């Protein structure tokens, strides 16, 4: 209560100090990240099957695992795919609010109990289970400019000298290695093996025997014979450590004395665990580390921590080994945080100027300078308590709140001044009277703004996570603003304000201020003259109002929607797709041709090109690839002609000439997620893969007959490719004394590669792979070079007990919720909503062959509440004003100001060509909130005059509108100026600033220019009808 702290200024100071301290403490022990966790918890089960095709992996691994994912809590849906690179990946997504830790341990446990049902080699390799919903803080590239070490060389070094150190660094939660440590490699030679009557079976047997850890006992171990003096351990054979030792492995001792070593039938060397992917950084061999942020950790304090650790392990790097930073989200956070402090600072300076321009005294201009910072620090404490963090969302959440904070400060101060000038009341008793005029109004406003913002924090799923940040942030600042405006501010007025004589409006005074006062004091007459005339012709303005409303609805539905504005993140990607059967070498040429384009025709804007040959977000293999382009700073790429979208389109148009493959550039998502749908075509019977493909093509062709509804409807997978089937004749095999096991191992190991056992390299355990030399496993004509020893001891060629044929199979098999499936992506045609393009796709799918179902996944799910929430919101707002005014009717004269603020925002957004995103929507709610605040005060004053001094309707409205002119004008002037920097901001996170800027400035101008004229009208017409 104001009257309590007017007599007790010191008490109010205590509260201000406590809030400041609590806030200061919070702004030091509060997490810092770019974005909060918005995506639903998701766990990914990864597994590997060396040499296995897409079909084998699915029918022995994927399917076995999927059948055991039962009993887990809060599953929304399961998804998986099985590539021809021997890899499988099962992603389980969970309900929002699900403890990711509990979800993962439940997934992990069910997987464990299913481990005994998997193939041996799949168990050897191991099965991973990790949280996949996480995002990278940065990726640390490690290249070799010296050209003295391969990517396998870099990888091993990073894993044995860097990975651990980085993991232990403060702030980092997880670390992914973009490569693989060394691994003993035995490249067999079929020509030599046959010469000594040997097979890959022998080579494996010998390695498992002459490379193992054999357990022995002790000397004088318990129970001992009494009298034993020493107790030592016995050491037996132990795993090999060098390449030389492996080559010395004995395979066969001929009957002539000589022996045959593993070195004699195979080249022995250290290589990588796999050779599927080859990475390059500006044409130079490279590796890297994908770093994730630990929960509750500070992104800035972590990025600095890893750079220190890297610099601390720098003097140990081999020659020509330098580290690069292709990807890094740290700069975004620094820029974001800096631009927030900047905005908050120049907001206080502007309020200082406008406060001195109108009031013309320092003591008064000092009050808002204290009230505002107090509230800010305070809300940081409130955020901390709720468990939030400093992030891009909550940051902008405050730069939109400063308008409501500055307002509450200006209203209390100005009202006290206006009172003393209209009557010879000293500050103390003038503050009491002044507060007595706005006490109830300020409380009611707090209720209304709560009713406006709190329901927004009830949207479900990912979208709800984003709104929840803004809402809670703004509501906290709002509630904490009113609280200060009832304790600290009233005390600061009755203490720091100097007396002002009655009638003293500075009308006669020297110079500018004297002129300004006469100017403004005469403009308040011209203004009340206009309102007076307006109230003589209300009908004419009721019509203009409807025109505004109608225009609002029109300008609203004609505004395109996107979830979050697109940004220039200083990086973008370019996909590369070669035809079926395309080799890794060919793919490389295209990637070189792509990298050469960036480091030449775009040298001014491109810093580096991370070419990853063999990877893709929707398919992997030798015929695929990605190029992660990293740009120079935003201060080196001036103009829209040098931004991501301009460079991207210019790059895609340039790669069209390449007749070798499909190559296109594209900016990445704002948050790692897009628009369009995520359609899932499901084989709900036993139809098979070919029958499912037909149902897909059939639906894709049908969707092609609706370019006015569906656009870019494409499969999100790989196309079937020719496979080389080998038919082993069981009869002729048993007729030659050849074991099927011998056959399927010499073939499986030589051509597919087999992981045999482990060895120690410089104190680290590493894998041992056996596999044919490249030149002996390339073409179908090589299969005849491989021999298999029979029982009689003779070597039998593969071309003796087998046949072959070309076939078609899938390189990537997909599944959804345990059933076969194919993912389909698309978007709604220009002008149409997603809710319409989805409804159509359901209709097209209903006409598909019997036994084919469908479902929505991802964004398209967690897809509906807006009107329901703002119907409850609209009601609560009404009930609040109803209690504030003790009237069922009056509330209407306030709720009618809504469109006035909206129309302006729509004008600005449409004019500049922006979208109806979350920043825009929140910008609306604050504009609506502020303009509403104005109406509440204007109505409160007018109504009061009628109830107290029994003034006429028009008399009261004109007097009320006059008293509120300056306050409204000031807060609006200081607001618009403080937002300008955001509207014109270019580059560096501007996409967000421009949204919160144009939407607010445009809406703020229209919400004050029209409100000061329209709200007096609303009050009158409402007071006349009811």
């Amino acid at each position: 209560m104001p009257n309590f702290f007017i007599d007790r200024p010191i008490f109010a100071w205590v509260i201000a100090i406590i809030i400041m301290l609590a806030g200061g403490l919070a702004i030091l022990k509060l997490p810092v990240a770019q974005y909060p966790t918005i995506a639903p918890p998701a766990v990914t089960i990864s597994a590997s099957y060396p040499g296995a095709d897409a079909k084998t992996v699915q029918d022995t691994v994927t399917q076995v695992i999927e059948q055991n994912m039962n009993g887990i809590d809060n599953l929304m849906y399961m998804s998986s795919n099985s590539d021809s690179t021997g890899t499988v990946q099962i992603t389980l997504t969970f309900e929002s609010g699900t403890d990711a830790d509990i979800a993962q341990v439940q997934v992990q446990n069910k997987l464990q109990l299913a481990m005994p049902l998997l193939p041996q080699e799949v168990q050897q390799q191991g099965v991973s289970v990790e949280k996949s919903s996480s995002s990278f803080l940065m990726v640390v590239g490690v290249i070799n400019t010296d050209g003295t070490m391969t990517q396998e060389d870099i990888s091993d070094y990073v894993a044995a000298n860097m990975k651990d150190a980085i993991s232990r660094t403060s702030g980092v939660g997880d670390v992914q290695l973009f490569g693989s440590q060394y691994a003993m490699r035995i490249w067999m030679n079929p020509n030599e093996l046959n010469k000594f009557q040997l097979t890959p079976v022998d080579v494996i047997t010998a390695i498992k025997a002459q490379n193992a850890q054999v357990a022995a006992g002790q000397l004088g171990g318990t129970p001992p014979v009494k009298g034993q003096q020493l107790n030592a351990s016995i050491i037996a054979q132990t795993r090999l450590t060098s390449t030389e030792e492996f080559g010395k492995i004995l395979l066969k001792v001929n009957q002539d004395g000589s022996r045959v070593l593993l070195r004699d039938v195979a080249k022995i060397e250290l290589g990588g665990e796999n050779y599927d992917i080859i990475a390059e950084f500006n044409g130079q061999p490279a590796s890297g580390l994908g770093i994730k942020l630990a929960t509750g950790a500070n992104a800035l304090d972590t990025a600095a921590a890893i750079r220190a650790e890297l610099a601390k392990m720098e003097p140990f790097f081999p020659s020509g080994l330098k580290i690069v930073y292709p990807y890094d989200t740290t700069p975004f956070v620094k820029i974001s945080i800096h631009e927030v402090v900047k905005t908050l600072v120049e907001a206080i300076i502007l309020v200082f100027l406008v406060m001195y321009l109108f009031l013309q005294n320092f003591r008064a201009t000092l009050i808002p300078t204290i009230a505002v910072p107090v509230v800010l620090l305070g809300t940081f404490a409130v955020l901390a308590a709720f468990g939030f963090s400093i992030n891009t969302l909550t940051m902008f959440g405050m730069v939109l709140a400063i308008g409501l904070l500055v307002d509450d400060a200006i209203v209390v101060v100005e009202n006290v001044e206006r009172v003393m000038a209209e009557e010879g009341l000293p500050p103390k008793e003038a503050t009491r009277k002044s507060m007595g005029q706005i006490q109830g109004a300020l409380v009611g406003i707090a209720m209304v703004l709560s009713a406006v913002f709190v329901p927004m924090a009830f949207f479900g799923g990912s979208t709800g996570a984003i709104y929840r940040q803004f809402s809670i942030t703004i509501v906290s600042a709002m509630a904490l603003s009113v609280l200060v405006a009832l304790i600290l501010t009233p005390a600061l007025c009755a203490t720091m304000l100097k007396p002002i004589a009655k009638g003293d409006h500075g009308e006669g005074k020297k110079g500018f201020f004297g002129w300004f006062n006469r100017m403004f004091e005469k403009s308040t007459h011209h203004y009340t003259d206009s309102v007076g005339g307006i109230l003589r012709s209300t009908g004419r303005y009721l019509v203009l109002y409807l025109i505004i409303v109608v225009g609002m609805a029109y300008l609203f539905v004609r505004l395109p929607s996107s979830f979050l504005p697109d940004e220039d993140q200083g990086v973008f990607m370019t996909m590369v797709q070669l035809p079926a059967g395309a080799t890794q070498e060919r793919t490389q040429k295209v990637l070189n041709e792509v990298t050469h384009y960036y480091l030449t025709k775009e040298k001014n804007n491109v810093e580096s090109v991370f070419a990853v040959n063999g990877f893709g977000f929707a398919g992997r293999g030798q015929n695929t690839g990605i190029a992660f382009v990293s740009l120079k700073d935003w201060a080196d790429r001036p103009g829209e002609e040098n931004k991501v979208e301009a460079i991207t389109m210019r790059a895609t148009r340039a790669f069209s000439q390449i007749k070798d493959a499909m190559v296109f550039a594209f900016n990445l998502p704002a948050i790692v997620t897009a628009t369009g749908f995520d359609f899932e075509l499901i084989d709900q019977a036993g139809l098979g893969h070919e029958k499912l493909t037909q149902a897909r093509n059939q639906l894709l062709a049908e969707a092609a007959k609706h370019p006015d509804m569906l656009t870019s409807v494409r499969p999100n997978g790989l196309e079937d490719t020719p496979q080389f089937k080998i038919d082993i004749d069981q009869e002729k095999a048993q007729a030659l004394g050849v074991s099927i096991n011998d056959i399927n191992t010499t073939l499986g190991a030589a051509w597919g590669g087999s992981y045999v056992n482990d060895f120690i390299d410089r104190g680290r355990v590493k894998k041992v792979y056996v596999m044919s030399e490249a030149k002996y496993r390339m073409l179908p004509d090589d299969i005849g070079d491989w021999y298999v020893r029979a029982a009689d001891g003779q070597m039998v060629p593969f071309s003796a007990f087998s046949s072959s044929r070309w076939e078609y199979g899938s390189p990537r098999l997909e599944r959804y919720n345990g059933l076969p499936s194919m993912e389909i992506l698309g978007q709604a045609a220009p002008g149409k909503s997603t809710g319409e393009a989805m409804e159509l796709m359901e209709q097209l799918a209903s006409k598909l062959p019997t036994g084919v179902g469908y479902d929505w996944t991802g964004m398209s799910y967690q897809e509906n509440q807006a009107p329901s929430l703002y119907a409850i919101s609209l009601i609560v707002v009404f009930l609040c004003l109803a209690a504030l005014y003790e009237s069922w009717s009056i509330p209407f004269s306030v709720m009618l100001v809504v469109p006035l603020g909206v129309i302006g925002a729509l004008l600005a957004a449409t004019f500049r060509g922006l979208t109806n995103d979350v920043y825009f929507q929140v910008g609306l709610l604050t504009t609506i909130g502020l303009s509403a605040k104005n109406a509440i005060l204007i109505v409160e004053f007018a109504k009061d005059l009628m109830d107290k001094e029994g003034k006429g309707l028009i008399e009261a409205t004109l007097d009320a509108v006059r008293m509120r002119l300056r306050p409204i004008l000031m807060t609006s002037l200081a607001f618009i100026l403080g937002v300008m920097p955001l509207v014109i901001s270019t580059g560096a996170g501007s996409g967000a600033q421009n949204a919160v800027g144009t939407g607010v400035m445009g809406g703020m101008v229209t919400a004050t220019v029209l409100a000061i004229f329209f709200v007096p009208v609303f009050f009158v017409v409402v007071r006349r009808r009811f």
Binding site: G581, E731, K732, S803, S804, R805, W806, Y808
Partner: protein, 154 residues
């Protein structure tokens, strides 16, 4: 190349695109690393309209694989009887042998397809012929366990 867009259409079963490519003279003898032609694909994946349109356009009925396989071989193995007859009318070698010695009959008898085995027989297909193993149409039927196919090929 239009030849590639033809291989995609011939496999996909898009008659409309295929005819269009015919207008535009997309190579009818186009190949991929397996040696399969648009006629190979169409026969294998069974679309007739394409097969006919392709044959009308000068396509090699006896186009061979890198492994020696032909369109009759493909159509016989898979199930398409209609395709088999059309191919035979256009001069498909009924006794074409694989690199492994397999003929259109073997692939037919291997998978059953009694209705397709009869057609191949009334066109001069050997009973006699041996695959790499030395199995014959009868040897394949007996081992497979098809009593009905045993009578036909006897």
């Amino acid at each position: 190349d239009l030849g590639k867009k033809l291989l995609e259409a011939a496999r996909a079963g898009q008659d409309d695109e295929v005819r269009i490519l015919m207008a535009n003279g997309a190579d009818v003898n186009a190949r991929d690393f397996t040696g399969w032609t648009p006629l190979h694909l169409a026969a294998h994946f069974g679309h007739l309209e394409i097969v006919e349109v392709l044959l009308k356009n000068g396509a090699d009925v006896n186009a061979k694989d890198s492994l020696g396989v032909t369109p009759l071989h493909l159509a016989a193995r898979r199930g398409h009887l209609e395709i088999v007859e059309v191919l035979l009318k256009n001069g498909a070698d009924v006794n074409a042998s694989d690199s492994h010695g397999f003929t259109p009959l073997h692939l037919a008898a291997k998978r059953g397809h009694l209705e397709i085995v009869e057609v191949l027989l009334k066109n001069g297909a050997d009973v006699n012929a041996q695959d790499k193993f030395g199995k014959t149409a009868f040897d394949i039927s007996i081992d497979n366990g098809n009593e009905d196919l045993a009578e036909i090929l006897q």
